[PDB]
A paper describes a structure:
5 is the terminal oxidase of cellular respiration that reduces O2 to water, coupled with a proton-pumping process. The enzyme includes two redox-active metal sites as the low-potential sites (heme a (Fea) and CuA). These sites donate electrons to the O2 reduction site that comprises two high potential metal sites (heme a3 (Fea3) and CuB). The third proton-conducting pathway, the H-pathway, extends for proton pumping from the N-side surface to the P-side surface.
The two azide terminally-bound CcO crystals were prepared by exposing resting oxidized CcO crystals to 20 mm azide for 3 days at 4 °C as described under “Experimental procedures. The structural refinement converged well for two azide ions, each coordinating to respective Fea3 and CuB, at the full occupancy, and the Fo − Fc map gave no significant residual electron density between the two metals. The present results reveal that the azide-binding sites, Fea33+ and CuB2+, have an unexpectedly high tolerance for large ligands and that each can accept a terminal azide ion. The binding of two azide ions to the two metal centers induces opening of the water channel without changing the oxidation and spin states of the metal centers, which is uniquely detectable in the azide-bound state. The two structures indicate a translational shift of the heme plane fixing the two propionate carboxyl groups and the terminal end of the hydroxy farnesyl ethyl group. In this paper, the azide-induced structure similar to that of the resting oxidized state is designated as structure A, and the other structure is designated as structure B throughout. The heme shift between structures A and B is accompanied by distortion of the Fea3–N coordination, which induces the multiple conformations in helix X. Structural refinements were performed for two conformers of helix X with different occupancy ratios, each at 0.1 step. The multiple conformation with the two structures in equal occupancy (0.5:0.5) provides two conformers with closely similar values of B-factor as shown in Table 3 and the lowest residual electron densities among those obtained assuming various occupancy ratios. One of the conformers (conformer A) is closely similar to that of the closed conformation, detectable in the resting oxidized state, in both of the main and side chains. The main-chain conformation of the other conformer (conformer B) is closely similar to that of the open conformer of the ligand-free fully reduced state, whereas the side chain of Met383 (indicated with a light blue oval in Fig. 5D) folds in a bent conformation, definitely different from that of the open conformation of the ligand-free fully reduced state. Thus, 20 mm azide induces the closed/open conformational transition without changing the oxidation state of the O2 reduction site.
Residue numbers in the entry:
A (entry chain G): 1 to 84
B (entry chain J): 1 to 58
C (entry chain L): 2 to 47
D (entry chain A): 1 to 514
E (entry chain I): 1 to 73
F (entry chain D): 4 to 147
G (entry chain M): 1 to 43
H (entry chain K): 6 to 54
The structure:
């Protein structure tokens, strides 16, 4: 592959700055727009107490032992279902 | 900012027999003592914790 | 500088053979005894 | 001055000395554990308790002998002492990081001793397989302390490996190519590469075990879609290279010892020896599932692992025959170190050949998890690694200390050990073939005779170990100072005297390119 | 008096080696005959002889009458 | 003469059969008579006495080949001492049996073994070679 | 190897002492534990 | 001059051998160790049922 | 564009690093970074071995690609010979301020 | 038609030592067939083969656990 | 490779160099005994005459010892070599190790 | 006085304090997991940080201030860093092996399918794609920083390095948000296990890499680096590329292929 | 079962075990031959005062040292792999039996026709009847038809175990969540013993396996009586 750009002559910082502001950061800005468009809360699926999920073989070493470290009440049910 | 590397070079090259970890001056000594005290004290505490945990407390 | 030469490049003294015998006895002896006392410890528990 | 020198060291010799002392102490611990094993088995019935206390002893025996005796002595001890001297380097590349590799070991050992003191210990085998090692069948802190002990030993050796590779590649005289470095230096370099690649995989596997035990992951738990067999793959991906890690520095020392006491300037077939160690190191990464022939693997997989495992015999045979060819025409000096090396060659060969028996998966179905495997590996470890260690120790003791051993005592010690280890392990072949399982605290009555003899053997080795301590004491007690050493022209490590000054090669060697 | 004859003076080690490697080989072939005959062939024959006229039902009846079975009296 | 530790970097004397001519003479310092002998050595060796020839040899070399290559009685000490310590080991095993081991299981009682042996024969344990093969089921005895 | 005579010779008697003390340092503590096994188990 | 081995070698060999054999024989035969040898040619089988 | 502000080694290197850099500019090697090139090694044309003391270890690779290196102390005074190949070496002592 | 059932025959889909998927597949197949048959008012007797095979191969505890989970609504396989 | 005759000739020439020095004498003998052979009488003869030019009686005796040693268990070799060297031994006044009692343990 | 170019290091307490910090962190984790206490762990983390700070401080003193980093010493450090990165690659390899083992042969407990029944994977085209663009962009900006430094350009080196660090922070914040928003957890069977442990160790390495870049930023501010001698920067850049490549493998394997 | 002072394998009860014995014999000869060749050559190297200490050329002899061992390995591998693929061949079983490992006992399920299952525990030493074998007898034996191809399926409901019967050449690990298959065929009636062959905790030494091999008609009646 050769991308589709095309440079080389001298070489160095100026080219990489050109790539930083002309390709890399624009790509980030575009992906940021794409992301902040498909964002903002999806409908949570019905709770089903599947035995291969919400595993508890030992209480967690924090909280009440039953909440995952970055527990999100909206989308993370407990073994007994979504919080009240 | 200004380039003060030459000043630090003079300081750390002073012929005073000090090891590099103490050559910055009195603050090195303090930070060293804090570190070693926490390590050695912590280690004694870990041994106490072992002593406690080696016997049933049911 | 540090001491150089036979008997000086070690963290233990060999200046007196009997004191050395005691230290080596404590050193190797403690290592060999430890598992027996751990077994004793485990047996005395439950 | 004491603390500066011995706790704050940046000196390869002193750090080497620390590792030798640590390894010697660990050897006493490992020896006691092995005697408890053989006391339990020395007559039919129960001596200590059921399989829990028994397998705590067995598990600790292995971890201590491997991680705290063999690796620290060969790599930390002989590696630190000899490698910089053998390449004329002023120290290791990272002399301060080197000291941390050492100091991580007493805490690692403390964590292992904690595991055995809390709850009922970790009676898991040194393999630590789930679900037995999981939080239901081994609830409580013991297994986690074992995992953490392994993490610390792993970090120590990984940083050590980085140090040795860098030192050996970067710090030779400019005229010295890698093909002008002694074979022990090669053996350490290759061992270090094996450590660098294998230990991180173990670290991943035991970390997964840690999270299964404490964070409700299910890597190895079928209830979550996990698989106990995945753990086995990750462990043995490290575990096979590990046994080559244990023996390679031994091969390196054996090459030096055999050359030296044959009065030769060089080992037979140097480039073949380098080739053999590299081939063994490489092949050592593609064979691991020979530890898993009974887990239910596909037939073609079992055919491949059978064949790949056997192939290692080729480069290994080159080394054995090259040692024999080094002896050929030698002015043989029957020193105690030479006796250790000759014992090594024969006993390593025996254990290698029983390995070949085991490589046949069909036969391994019947021999797996029996004493035949125990016999196989004690011939390569207790009569390979240990004999190479004892050989190197008696050979280089005068370099490290500046004092001589009593050669007669050292020959007596060798004789007792040789009888003891063979009486201990040879009968275990019979026990394995006739079906005695591993990790048993008691056996059906038919197995009594061989177990009795094996246990009697272990006591003979105990006597040898006690005598070894006395022999070291006698040397330091009498203080016979070294004067002259033969063959310095081809053994650079001796050329700075005995013991060498704290700082050696402050002015580097002169080697021209021609 | 008489002069001593000139003996062979060169390659004494190599000659010793040559002679004994062949002897090491000849032993191996001599032993190969032994282990094959005393162990391997003996085993083949023992199994062939055992099964040639072996009657499994008769074997079972003897065991049954001896009272060894849970499933058969 | 007297070898010093601090001479380690200097060429040294060695007696070994594969290095017959070492880097230095055994004795470098010469007395008045020994100087005269070294001068005499510059003339015909036929004029040297046997004693003078031996003295010249012993100035140059420490031990002769016959001396340096001599066999010793060391093996007796090694083998004897090894057997003593192996013997001492049996004392430890005697102690263990007396003070550590309790009784073995009742299944090793003579009568149990006799009955167990018959039951093994009744179930034809190893009937091809190993066990029952050695019993004569016709004569009701062990095969000769 | 060559070496100087011992700077501090260890006589046969002294060796007997060093050897005995060394052996006892291994044997006595382990012996004590194994002797008292029944006491530990049945308690 | 005669060394340790010249003076004591014979005695060390003789006594070591004698002691070793004597104590192993005693240990093997006199203290109730059960070796559990083969019953073949040794044990008379007895009715068990 | 334009901006400097980054010091050079010439401006800022110090200690041993600076010594090595300055010596290299003069084609000198006081810290033994380079392999010395051999002479014919005869008694008239011996390999000249610099040293800051009165003895230095020589390693002799007698023939190209020999894996075995022959090691010996070279002392101030009369040229010495490799004990394997006999090539001559002579010590040339004195000073690091060379 | 295949009567005189002895045990589950060799299945080329599952030729190796690990037979877990064989048990699983036949359990799925039986219950999928049974659902298909009860829905269209047909005969469950046509599903019998899969039933015999999974009964032969599957540990009792697996079958029991799977049955419980189907009843609970927590069976993770598609039926 | 070179014949036995050529090997011997090179070694005779080595020791026959008029101004051979002490170092070269030792180097020659210490190298020669590394080979799988007992040196021909003509080689030893040249080495002994080198000893004479170097005023070194002791080394001449030592050379005779190493000939015996290189023969190992072949007891017939040394007496043959001494036989062949007798005219040279007589000419140079070299006593054998045996004549000097140096074969005694 | 030495006449080789290698560094004889002053006797140092940091190896011992580091080793003890390891004991404290591990016994601390044990205390936390089994005896409901964070005390040992917090002490261990503290002494570990203190050890790292003073050790690397001293390396800067030894090099920038004392001149011990000759070309030969630098070359050793190059090898050291490369070998360290290799060991880290093998560490991640273990987790990728676990992931492929579980996903290529999903067990009956999962529904015999991947992703498991009841698992709703993130959309790889949303925040995970954004994260990918972010780390790739930071690889470009760090390369700009490297060239500016070699060309002697202080201001542009600082600007490019700041941009690189900002992107590292952005990734870390995006990942933290994604962790919070994820409808599955570490306890959600082998899917959750592989996802969070693999991406979690990666996230830790991003934090480590970002910290290393921040160290370089402040050293640059203090003029430590010359246009020719700046191994700390090179090492941080190599480590940063390593972190990028691991992400690319995670993205392709776990987020995309495993969705 | 093993007998006192046994040196080798238990007598073969199955054709596959017979094959393993002959293959072991083949391999062990080679093991003996190499070990002795090495011991002999070693003693040869060490028993002469003759010396040759100059540099020795290596390449010619290294050809021998690589080629000969390679040939020997092929001579082992050929029959080894033949047996491997023989064991793997399709054989059509007449019966399927499951065994589940537990701490610390085995359970058995014969569910081809009826729901037959039971637990199998070691007979405690204090309860052995005269003539019974310490640590080996069970309360409920695994009764099986002789001279018939039987499919054994092996799993666990807790930790790892391993189901082994040495005289039949059998050892299959018992892994929870996994169903491992092996085939079994006894040439003879009788009692064939094995022991748990994966470390599984406190009573690992004490959960044995006893197979009772009888004619089909006896097996059928036993099966019916066990319902
Ligand atoms: C130093 C340690 C060491 C070494 C070097 C080896 C070397 C070898 N090992 Fe071993 N092994 C262990 C330590 C070691 N092993 C341990 C600890 C275990 C079990 C771990 C556990 O379960 O806890 C184990 C387990 C193990 C198994 C698993 C058995 C089982 O668990 O069921 C197998 C089978 O493949 C095996 C085979 C081999 C082979 C083929 C070699 C070969 O590399 C040996 C090659 C050497 C020779 C063959 C001798 C020299 C060669 C010649 C003289 C030439 C002539 C020879 C021929 C033509 C064959 N080993
Ligand atoms: C941006 C990511 C950075 C992570 C930040 C969190 C701090 C932990 C430190 C990082 C180390 C990462 C690996 C450890 C594994 C577990 C953490 C995985 C990453 C993570 O943070 O996973 C979280 C769970 O964390 C949990 O359990 C909490 C677990 C915290 C305890 C630490 C675990 C013990 C560490 C063991 C490491 C040993 C390594 C040894 C290396 C030696 C090599 C030789 C996910 O949250 P959740 O609510 O389940 O799901 C989200 C639902 N909305
Ligand atoms: C939540 C976080 C907690 C976890 C703990 C980890 C925390 C993060 C630590 C971040 C790493 C910071 C490293 C800073 C190193 C600064 C010292 C330095 O960079 O030293 C440089 C040498 O490189 C050198 O040693 C390079 C050596 C250092 C490289 C090592 C960096 C990686 C370490 C990461 C630890 C791995 C953890 C693994 C997790 C499983 C100095 O040489 P130069 O730069 O050429 O200067 C000289 C010129 O000035 C002369 O003109
Ligand atoms: C040089 C400096 C280094 C040395 C540092 C030594 C400090 C030691 C003192 C700490 O002791 C505290 O005691 C608490 C109470 O006694 C404990 O809490 C624990 O104790 C209870 C039982 O678990 C619970 O109530 C708590 O939640 C639980 O965290 C816990 O061990 C610890 O915090
Ligand atoms: C596995 C390796 C170890 C195996 C070899 C051990 C060899 C034994 C060494 C001696 O050990 C001692 O034996 C004494 C008995 O001989 C014990 O005294 C015990 O018995 C005496 C006699 O009954 C009493 O007087 C004492 O009070 C009582 O402690 C004593 O405690 C114990 O130290
Ligand atoms: C003050 C300093 C001038 C360089 C010098 O000291 O000689 C300048 C040059 C580059 C600057 C940095 C870079 O431009 C990147 C950052 C840009 C942000 O807008 C402010 C902070 C930021 C981190 C700047 C802080 C400060 O103004 C810097 C560090
Ligand atoms: Cu069940 Cu071991
Ligand atoms: Cu292996
Ligand atoms: Mg197993
Ligand atoms: Na027992
Ligand atoms: Zn040379």
């Amino acid at each position: 592959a050769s991308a589709a750009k095309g440079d080389h002559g001298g070489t160095g910082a100026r080219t990489w700055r050109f790539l930083t502001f002309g390709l890399a950061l624009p790509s980030v800005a575009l992906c940021t727009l794409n992301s902040w468009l498909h964002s903002g809360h999806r409908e949570r699926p019905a709770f089903i107490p599947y035995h291969h999920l919400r595993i508890r073989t030992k209480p967690f070493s924090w909280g009440d032992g039953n909440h995952t470290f970055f527990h999100n009440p909206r989308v993370n049910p407990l073994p007994t279902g979504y919080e009240k | 900012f200004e380039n003060r590397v030459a000043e630090k070079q003079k300081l750390f090259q002073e012929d005073n027999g000090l090891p590099v970890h103490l050559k910055g001056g009195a603050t090195d000594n303090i930070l060293y003592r804090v570190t070693m005290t926490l390590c050695l004290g912590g280690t004694l505490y870990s041994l106490y914790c072992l002593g406690w945990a080696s016997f049933p407390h049911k | 500088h540090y001491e150089e030469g036979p008997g000086k490049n070690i963290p233990f003294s060999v200046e007196n053979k009997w004191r050395l015998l005691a230290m080596m006895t404590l050193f190797f002896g403690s290592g060999f005894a430890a598992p027996f006392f751990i077994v004793r410890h485990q047996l005395l528990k439950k | 001055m004491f603390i500066n020198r011995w706790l704050f060291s940046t000196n390869h010799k002193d750090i080497g000395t620390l590792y030798l002392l640590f390894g010697a102490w660990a050897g006493m611990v490992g020896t006691a554990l092995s005697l408890l094993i053989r006391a339990e088995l020395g007559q039919p019935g129960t001596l200590l308790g059921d399989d829990q206390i028994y397998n705590v002893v067995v598990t600790a025996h292995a971890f201590v002998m491997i991680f705290f005796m063999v690796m620290p002595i060969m790599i930390g001890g002989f590696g630190n002492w000899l490698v910089p001297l053998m390449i004329g380097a002023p120290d290791m590349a990272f002399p301060r990081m080197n000291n941390m590799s050492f100091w991580l070991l007493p805490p690692s050992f403390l964590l292992l001793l904690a595991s055995s003191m809390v709850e009922a210990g970790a009676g898991t085998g040194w393999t630590v397989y789930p679900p037995l090692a999981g939080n239901l069948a081994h609830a409580g802190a013991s297994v986690d302390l074992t995992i953490f002990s392994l993490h610390l030993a792993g970090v120590s050796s990984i940083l050590g490996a980085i140090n040795f590779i860098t030192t050996i590649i970067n710090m030779k005289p400019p005229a010295m190519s890698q093909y002008q470095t002694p074979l022990f230096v090669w053996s350490v370099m290759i061992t270090a590469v094996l450590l660098l690649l294998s230990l991180p995989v173990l670290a991943a596997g035991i970390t997964m075990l840690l999270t299964d035990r404490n964070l409700n992951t299910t890597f190895f738990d079928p209830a979550g879609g996990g698989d106990p067999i995945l753990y086995q793959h990750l462990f043995w991906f490290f575990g096979h290279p590990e046994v080559y890690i244990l023996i390679l520095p031994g091969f390196g020392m054996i090459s030096h010892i055999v050359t030296y006491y044959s009065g030769k300037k060089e080992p037979f077939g140097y480039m073949g020896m380098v080739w053999a160690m590299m081939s063994i190191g490489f092949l050592g990464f593609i064979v691991w599932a020979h530890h898993m022939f009974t887990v239910g693997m596909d037939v073609d997989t079992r055919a491949y692992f059978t064949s790949a495992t056997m192939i290692i015999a080729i480069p290994t045979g080159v080394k054995v025959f090259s040692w024999l060819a080094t002896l050929h025409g030698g002015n043989i000096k029957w020193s105690p170190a030479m006796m250790w090396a000759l014992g090594f060659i024969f006993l390593f060969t025996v254990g290698g050949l029983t390995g070949i028996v085991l490589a046949n998966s069909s036969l391994d179905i019947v021999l797996h998890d029996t004493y035949y495997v125990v016999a196989h590996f004690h011939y390569v470890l207790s009569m390979g690694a240990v004999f190479a260690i004892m050989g190197g120790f008696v050979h280089w003791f005068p370099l490290f200390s500046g004092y001589t051993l009593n050669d007669t005592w050292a020959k007596i010690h060798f004789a007792i050990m040789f009888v003891g280890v063979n009486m201990t392990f040879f009968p275990q072949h019979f026990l394995g073939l006739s079906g005695m399982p591993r990790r048993y605290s008691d056996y059906p009555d038919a197995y009594t005779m061989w177990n009795t003899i094996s246990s009697m053997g272990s006591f003979i080795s105990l006597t040898a170990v006690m005598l070894m301590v006395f022999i070291i004491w006698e040397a330091f007690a009498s203080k016979r100072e070294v004067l002259t050493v033969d063959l310095t022209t081809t053994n650079l490590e001796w050329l700075n005297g005995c013991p060498p000054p704290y700082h050696t090669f402050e002015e580097p060697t002169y080697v021209n390119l021609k | 008096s008489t002069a001593l004859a000139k003996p062979q003076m060169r390659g004494l080690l190599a000659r010793r080696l040559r002679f004994h490697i062949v002897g090491a080989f000849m032993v191996s072939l001599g032993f190969a005959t032994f282990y094959k005959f005393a162990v391997a062939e003996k085993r083949k024959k023992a199994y062939a002889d055992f099964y040639r006229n072996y009657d499994s039902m008769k074997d079972f009846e003897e065991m049954r009458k001896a009272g060894i079975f849970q499933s058969a009296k | 003469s007297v070898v010093k530790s601090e001479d380690y970097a200097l060429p040294s004397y060695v007696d070994r059969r594969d290095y017959p001519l070492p880097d230095v003479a055994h004795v470098k310092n010469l007395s008045a008579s020994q100087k005269a002998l070294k001068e005499k050595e510059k003339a015909s060796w036929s004029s040297l006495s046997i004693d003078e020839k031996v003295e010249l040899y012993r100035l140059k070399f420490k031990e002769s080949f016959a001396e340096m290559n001599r066999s010793t009685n060391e093996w007796k000490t090694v083998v004897g001492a090894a057997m003593f310590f192996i013997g001492f080991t049996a004392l430890l095993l005697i102690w263990e049996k007396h003070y550590v081991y309790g009784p073995i299981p009742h299944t090793f009682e003579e009568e149990w073994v006799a009955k167990q042996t018959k039951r093994m024969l009744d179930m034809k344990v190893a009937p091809i070679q190993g066990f029952s093969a050695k019993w004569d089921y016709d004569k009701n005895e062990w095969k000769k | 190897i060559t070496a100087k005579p011992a700077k501090t010779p260890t006589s046969p008697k002294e060796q007997a002492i060093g050897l005995s003390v060394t052996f006892l340092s291994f044997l006595l503590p382990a012996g004590w534990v194994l002797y008292h096994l029944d006491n530990y188990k049945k308690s | 001059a005669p060394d340790f081995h010249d003076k004591y070698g014979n005695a060390v060999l003789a006594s070591g051998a004698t002691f070793c054999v004597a104590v192993w024989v005693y240990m093997a035969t006199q203290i109730g160790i059960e070796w559990n040898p083969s019953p073949v040619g040794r044990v008379t089988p007895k009715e068990w049922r | 564009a334009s901006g400097g502000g980054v010091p050079t080694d010439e401006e800022q290197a110090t200690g041993l690093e600076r010594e090595v850099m300055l010596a290299a500019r003069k084609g000198q090697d006081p810290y033994n970074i380079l392999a010395p090139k051999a002479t014919s090694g005869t008694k008239e044309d011996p390999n000249l071995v610099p040293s800051i003391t009165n003895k230095r270890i020589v390693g002799c690779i007698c023939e190209e690609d020999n894996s075995t290196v022959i090691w010996f102390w070279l002392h101030k005074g009369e040229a010495q010979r490799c004990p394997s190949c006999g090539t001559h070496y002579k010590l040339v002592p004195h000073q690091l301020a060379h | 038609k295949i009567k005189n059932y002895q045990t589950a025959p060799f299945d080329s889909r599952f030729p190796n030592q690990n037979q877990t998927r064989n048990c699983w597949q036949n359990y799925l197949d039986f219950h999928r067939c049974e659902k298909a048959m009860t829905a269209k008012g047909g005969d469950v007797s046509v599903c019998e083969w899969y039933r015999r095979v999974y009964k032969s191969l599957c540990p009792i505890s697996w079958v029991s656990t799977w049955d419980d989970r189907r009843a609970e609504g927590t069976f993770p396989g598609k039926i | 490779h070179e014949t036995d005759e050529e090997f011997d000739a090179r070694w005779v020439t080595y020791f026959n160099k008029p101004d051979i020095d002490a170092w070269e004498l030792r180097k020659g003998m210490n190298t020669l005994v590394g080979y799988d052979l007992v040196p021909e009488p003509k080689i030893i003869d040249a080495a002994l005459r080198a000893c004479r030019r170097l005023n070194d009686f002791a080394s001449a005796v030592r050379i005779l010892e190493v000939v015996k040693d290189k023969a190992g268990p072949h007891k017939e070799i040394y007496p043959y070599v001494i036989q062949e060297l007798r005219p040279t031994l007589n000419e140079l006044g070299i006593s054998t190790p045996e004549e000097l009692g140096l074969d005694k343990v | 006085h030495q006449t080789h170019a290698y560094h004889m290091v002053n006797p140092s307490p940091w190896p011992l304090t580091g080793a003890l910090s390891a004991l404290l962190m591990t016994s601390g984790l044990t205390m936390w997991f089994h005896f409901n206490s964070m005390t040992l762990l917090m002490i261990g983390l503290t002494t570990n940080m203190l050890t790292m700070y003073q050790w690397w401080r001293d390396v800067i003193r030894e090099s920038t201030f004392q001149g011990h980093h000759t070309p030969a010493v630098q070359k050793g450090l190059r090898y050291g860093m490369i070998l360290f990165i290799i060991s880290e690659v093998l560490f991640f390899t273990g987790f990728f092996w676990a992931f492929y083992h579980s996903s290529l042969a999903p067990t009956p407990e999962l529904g015999g399918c991947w992703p498991p029944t009841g698992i709703h994977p993130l959309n790889p085209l949303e925040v995970p794609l954004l994260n990918t663009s972010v780390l790739l962009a930071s690889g470009v900006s760090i390369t700009w920083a490297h060239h500016s430094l070699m060309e002697g350009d202080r201001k542009h080196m600082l600007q490019a390095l700041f941009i690189t660090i900002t992107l590292g922070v952005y990734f870390t914040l995006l990942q933290a948000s994604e962790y919070y928003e994820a409808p599955f957890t570490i306890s959600d069977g082998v899917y959750g296990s592989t996802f969070f442990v693999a991406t979690g160790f990666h996230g830790l390495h991003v934090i480590i890499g970002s910290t290393f870049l921040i160290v370089c930023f402040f050293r640059q501010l203090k003029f430590h680096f010359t246009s020719n001698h700046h191994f700390g920067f090179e090492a941080a850049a190599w480590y940063w590329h390593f972190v990028d490549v691991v992400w690319l493998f995670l993205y392709v394997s776990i987020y995309w292929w495993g969705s | 079962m093993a007998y006192p002072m046994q040196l080798g394998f238990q007598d073969a009860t199955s054709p596959i075990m017979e094959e393993l014995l002959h293959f072991h014999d083949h391999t062990l000869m080679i093991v003996f031959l190499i070990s002795s060749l090495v011991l002999y050559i070693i003693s040869l190297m060490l028993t002469t005062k003759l010396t040759h200490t100059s540099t020795m050329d290596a390449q010619e002899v290294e050809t021998i040292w690589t080629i000969l061992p390679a040939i020997i390995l092929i001579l082992i591998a050929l029959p080894s792999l033949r047996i491997l693929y023989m064991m793997d061949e399709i054989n059509n079983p007449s019966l399927t039996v499951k065994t589940m490992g537990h701490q610390w006992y085995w359970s058995y399920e014969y569910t081809d026709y009826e729901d037959l299952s039971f637990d199998s525990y070691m007979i405690p030493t204090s309860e052995l009847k005269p003539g019974e074998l310490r640590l080996l007898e069970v309360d409920n034996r695994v009764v099986l038809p002789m001279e018939m191809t039987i499919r054994m399926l092996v799993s666990s409901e807790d930790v790892l175990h391993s189901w082994a019967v040495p005289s039949l050449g059998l050892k299959t690990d018992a892994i929870p969540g996994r169903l491992n298959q092996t085939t079994l065929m006894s040439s003879r009636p009788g009692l064939y013993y094995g022991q748990c062959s994966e470390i599984c905790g406190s009573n690992h030494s004490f959960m044995p396996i006893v197979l009772e091999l009888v004619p089909l008609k006896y097996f059928e009646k036993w099966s019916a009586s066990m319902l």
